[PDB]
Structures are given as C-alpha cells and as structure tokens.
Swiss-Prot record:
Interacts with EGFR. Interacts with ELOB and ELOC; mediates EGFR ubiquitination and degradation. Interacts with IL4R; inhibits IL4 signaling. Signal peptide: none annotated. SOCS family proteins form part of a classical negative feedback system that regulates cytokine signal transduction. May be a substrate-recognition component of a SCF-like ECS (Elongin BC-CUL2/5-SOCS-box protein) E3 ubiquitin-protein ligase complex which mediates the ubiquitination and subsequent proteasomal degradation of target proteins. Inhibits for instance EGF signaling by mediating the degradation of the EGF receptor/EGFR. Involved in the regulation of T-helper cell differentiation by inhibiting of the IL4 signaling pathway which promotes differentiation into the Th2 phenotype. Phosphorylated. Phosphorylation is induced by EGF. The lineage of its organism: Eukaryota, Metazoa, Chordata, Craniata, Vertebrata. The SOCS box domain mediates the interaction with the Elongin BC complex, an adapter module in different E3 ubiquitin ligase complexes. Widely expressed. Expressed in TH1 but not TH2 cells. This is Suppressor of cytokine signaling 5. It comes from Mus musculus (Mouse). Induction: By a subset of cytokines including IL6 and LIF.
Length: 70
C-alpha cells in the first residue's frame, strides 16, 4: 500500500474548449529576405509614365489604406 504517487501539477492545466479540428490554413511567401527599413525602395519595376505604375501607387508599400487584410 502507498500514497503520493508523483506530483507534476505546475506545468500547466491544459487548454480544453480550444481544439475541435477543422484546421488547415497553409501559406506561401517570400519570407527570410526582408529588410527592417524597406519603404517602397527596390519595388518600382515599371517605367516612369506608364499605367502599370499607377496601379503600383495603389499598393504603395508593405502597408497602405486598403482595408484590413490580416
């Protein structure tokens, strides 16, 4: 006969009601090459004075007034 078989009750308390399957949102991008001060710099691949560039001004940078996305 015996008692107090272990104690390991400080490592957390699980996460119930936080798992229900239906989990698949893969993504794909150019990561692991980006700067930390990049503001439109290297990103003007079109000539001056053509319609391709007027669309480019729409996106502008990594961030613009375009609605929330993620």
């Amino acid at each position: 006969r015996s008692l107090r078989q272990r104690l390991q009750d400080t490592v957390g308390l699980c996460f119930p009601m936080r798992t229900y399957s239906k989990q698949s949102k893969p993504l794909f991008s150019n990561k692991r090459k980006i700067h930390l001060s990049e503001l439109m710099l290297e990103k003007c691949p079109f000539p001056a004075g053509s319609d391709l560039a007027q669309k480019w001004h729409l996106i502008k940078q990594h961030t613009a007034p375009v609605s929330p996305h993620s």
